[PDB]
Amino acid sequence: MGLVENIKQFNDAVSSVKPGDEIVLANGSWNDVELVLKGKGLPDKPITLKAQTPGKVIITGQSNLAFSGEYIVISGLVFKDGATPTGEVISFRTSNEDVANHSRVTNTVIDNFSTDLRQMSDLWVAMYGKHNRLDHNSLVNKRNRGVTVAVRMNSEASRKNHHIIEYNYFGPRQILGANGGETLRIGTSHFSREYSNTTAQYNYFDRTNGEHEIISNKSSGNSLIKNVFFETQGTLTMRHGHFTKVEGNYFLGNRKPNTGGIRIINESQTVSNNYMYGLTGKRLRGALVIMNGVPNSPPNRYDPVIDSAMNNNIVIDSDHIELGAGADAERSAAPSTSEFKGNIILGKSNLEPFTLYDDMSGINFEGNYLNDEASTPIKTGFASTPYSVTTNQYGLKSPDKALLDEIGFGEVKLPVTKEEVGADFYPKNEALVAFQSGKTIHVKAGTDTLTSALATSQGGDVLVLENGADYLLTKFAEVHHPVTIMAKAGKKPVIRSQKPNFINIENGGALEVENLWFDGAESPDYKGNTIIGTSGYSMNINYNLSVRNVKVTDLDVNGYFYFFKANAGTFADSIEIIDSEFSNITGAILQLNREVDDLGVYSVENLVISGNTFTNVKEEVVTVYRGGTDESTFGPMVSVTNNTLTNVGKGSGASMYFHGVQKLNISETKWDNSAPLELFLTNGGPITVIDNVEMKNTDKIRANNDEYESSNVTYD
Ligand SMILES: O=C[C@@H](O)[C@@H](O)CC(=O)C(=O)O
Numbered sequence: 001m002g003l004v005e006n007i008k009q010f011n012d013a014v015s016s017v018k019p020g021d022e023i024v025l026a027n028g029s030w031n032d033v034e035l036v037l038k039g040k041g042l043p044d045k046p047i048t049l050k051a052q053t054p055g056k057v058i059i060t061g062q063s064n065l066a067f068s069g070e071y072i073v074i075s076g077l078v079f080k081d082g083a084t085p086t087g088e089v090i091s092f093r094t095s096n097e098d099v100a101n102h103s104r105v106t107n108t109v110i111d112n113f114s115t116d117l118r119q120m121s122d123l124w125v126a127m128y129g130k131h132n133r134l135d136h137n138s139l140v141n142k143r144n145r146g147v148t149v150a151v152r153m154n155s156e157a158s159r160k161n162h163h164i165i166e167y168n169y170f171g172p173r174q175i176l177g178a179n180g181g182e183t184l185r186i187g188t189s190h191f192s193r194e195y196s197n198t199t200a201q202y203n204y205f206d207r208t209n210g211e212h213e214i215i216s217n218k219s220s221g222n223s224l225i226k227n228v229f230f231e232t233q234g235t236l237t238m239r240h241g242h243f244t245k246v247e248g249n250y251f252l253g254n255r256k257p258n259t260g261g262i263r264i265i266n267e268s269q270t271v272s273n274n275y276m277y278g279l280t281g282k283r284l285r286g287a288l289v290i291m292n293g294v295p296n297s298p299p300n301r302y303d304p305v306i307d308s309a310m311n312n313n314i315v316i317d318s319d320h321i322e323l324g325a326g327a328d329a330e331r332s333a334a335p336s337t338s339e340f341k342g343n344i345i346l347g348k349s350n351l352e353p354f355t356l357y358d359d360m361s362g363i364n365f366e367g368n369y370l371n372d373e374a375s376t377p378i379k380t381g382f383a384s385t386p387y388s389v390t391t392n393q394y395g396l397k398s399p400d401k402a403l404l405d406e407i408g409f410g411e412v413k414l415p416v417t418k419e420e421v422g423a424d425f426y427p428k429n430e431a432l433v434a435f436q437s438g439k440t441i442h443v444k445a446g447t448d449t450l451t452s453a454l455a456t457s458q459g460g461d462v463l464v465l466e467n468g469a470d471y472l473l474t475k476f477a478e479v480h481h482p483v484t485i486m487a488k489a490g491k492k493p494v495i496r497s498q499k500p501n502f503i504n505i506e507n508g509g510a511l512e513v514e515n516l517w518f519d520g521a522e523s524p525d526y527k528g529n530t531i532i533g534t535s536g537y538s539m540n541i542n543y544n545l546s547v548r549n550v551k552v553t554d555l556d557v558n559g560y561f562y563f564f565k566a567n568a569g570t571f572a573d574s575i576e577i578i579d580s581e582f583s584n585i586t587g588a589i590l591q592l593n594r595e596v597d598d599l600g601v602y603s604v605e606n607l608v609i610s611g612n613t614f615t616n617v618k619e620e621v622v623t624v625y626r627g628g629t630d631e632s633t634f635g636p637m638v639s640v641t642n643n644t645l646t647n648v649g650k651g652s653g654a655s656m657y658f659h660g661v662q663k664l665n666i667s668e669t670k671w672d673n674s675a676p677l678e679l680f681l682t683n684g685g686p687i688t689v690i691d692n693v694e695m696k697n698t699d700k701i702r703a704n705n706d707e708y709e710s711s712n713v714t715y716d
Pocket residue numbers: 179212213239284630631632633
């Protein structure tokens with residue numbers, strides 16, 4: 001009815017609207033626009049805001065959309081490469097009192113509508129009101145904190161909403177390094193006993209790894225049904241609220257790390273007829289979890305599990321069923337009047353898949369099946385059955401037909417596929433370029449030849465330097481995309497710089513270095529120099545750093561000269577230091593700074609330090625620190641093997657410091673006249689094994705509790 005091409009025209013057409021009329025945004029870029037629409041349509045005659053050509057109306061910059069009234073439809077829009085100036089990108093309200101009812105947002109894309117600051121939280125879709133629908137939308141590349149889709153519950157007008165959220169595509173969500181990266185949140189703790197009655201169904205969660213809670217259910221009466229979770233880190237958690245129905249969901253973990261399933265807390269939960277495959281998560285992130293709760297819990301803790309059922313689920317090739325998880329002096333109430341019946345557990349990666357943290361007498365176990373090779377400590381309710389798992393018609397590892405029929409599961413088949421969800425006009429393209437997937441480029445010896453070669457390289461490229469040759473930098477060597485810098489086998493080239501940082505990983509960058517020699521003879525006379533650094537600003541794209549067969553010498557022109565220094569506000573999916581040699585360094589090897597707001601922030605997910613020698617380093621090799629009390633979130637995972645530290649950390653101090661690491665493995669490593677190893681084991685169960693280490697002329701391991709396992713610790 002009304003085609004508009006500028007904000008002025010838009011605001012005129014929506015100043016007065018009647019049932020049936022539509023406002024069309026003409027194709028093109030809509031930059032820095034705050035779209036507001038109020039009106040009252042009709043069941044047969046909605047008020048529609050639509051794109052001229054779905055995929056060709058690009059809302060960008062500092063933009064958002066807020067609407068209120070009745071029977072509004074919003075379709076075909078794209079929000080790409082911007083950030084909302086409010087708290088919400090698409091909002092089903094226009095003020096605290098004016099909400100949308102019986103309205104719909106469909107066939108719409110939000111693509112990287114992320115703040116440049118990774119620590120700032122917003123909501124991408126905020127649902128208010130009653131009887132709203134959110135369907136067939138694509139939400140991709142959320143790089144900051146916050147919830148992608150939230151159902152709000154802060155007033156009566158938004159409770160008992162019966163919203164429907166369905167057929168949406170939730171694309172990859174990088175690990176945040178902090179709390180609050182849920183994909184779907186239904187309610188909040190402050191209104192958690194209130195009823196929402198939301199249905200989320202037929203959605204596809206694709207590597208939505210923001211945090212441990214993929215779906216944070218925080219209100220009563222919801223149905224989370226018939227969704228697909230593909231290699232998703234974290235769980236579907238019934239965090240607060242009762243009378244949740246969780247059925248027909250398929251978790252395709254594929255043996256990826258930290259892949260969890262369904263966590264029951266609180267009352268009258270039904271978790272049945274779900275399918276799980278290849279889930280590796282443990283404890284609060286296990287494939288199936290039933291928590292202990294706090295008697296007379298405050299609304300923000302954990303209600304004891306009562307009147308709940310966990311039945312007729314299929315759990316294949318998964319590792320952890322955790323009953324009573326969280327049990328302690330506070331969470332002292334074990335599950336009661338609940339049942340665990342008719343489940344099929346077929347896995348061989350963990351032959352003792354159950355952990356019981358408390359008395360499970362309050363749970364009636366009946367009719368379950370567990371593969372011959374595995375055992376349960378529960379005396380009743382389980383029958384052993386052979387491990388028979390065959391890929392079926394729809395490409396899914398399935399139990400035998402006779403067991404399926406015995407529990408009335410039906411076919412093992414996805415309730416929805418990747419191809420049936422999201423906007424119909426927007427591709428689902430990978431956004432990450434792999435190391436060495438591009439061209440090999442020669443870098444001749446000399447001054448700023450590496451600088452120039454990087455400036456024109458592309459993601460995936462490999463810069464190959466001349467063996468034994470000299471390289472000098474007088475400018476920053478900036479890495480704007482995944483790149484490899486290396487020499488083929490033979491004599492290491494030597495790299496020097498007159499700048500305070502040799503190489504900086506910029507936002508979007510990631511770096512492999514192999515068979516290089518970095519030396520400090522040309523470095524400037526400043527404190528805080530480093531060989532490799534991050535960008536110096538918040539980087540809302542996680543980076544990666546791989547260092548293999550590298551030699552680093554004479555970082556001593558001034559104090560605090562580090563090998564690698566990540567500034568506050570950056571996050572590394574993986575840092576690997578392999579088979580490398582470091583000598584005469586006044587700083588730390590790895591300086592992993594943090595921007596402390598949430599005390600739970602951490603700056604690296606996976607750290608591997610293996611095959612190295614560290615000699616005459618005044619500061620530590622690495623401090624890995626996560627504060628706060630979140631037992632539930634990830635921790636860094638750290639592996640330290642086959643290294644030698646000679647005169648490290650003596651410039652009282654420590655040579656390595658690990659604090660709030662959820663998984664720490666140290667082995668085959670010798671300290672020689674170094675500061676001691678320092679540990680701090682946080683509440684929960686941080687897994688910590690230290691085997692075959694020699695502490696020659698080194699003080700005793702510094703720890704807070706004896707809570708770790710240790711074997712073969714020699715003190716010379
Ligand atoms: O804030 C801490 C959170 O871990 C918790 O309250 C909510 C949650 O996600 C959990 O316990 O796992």
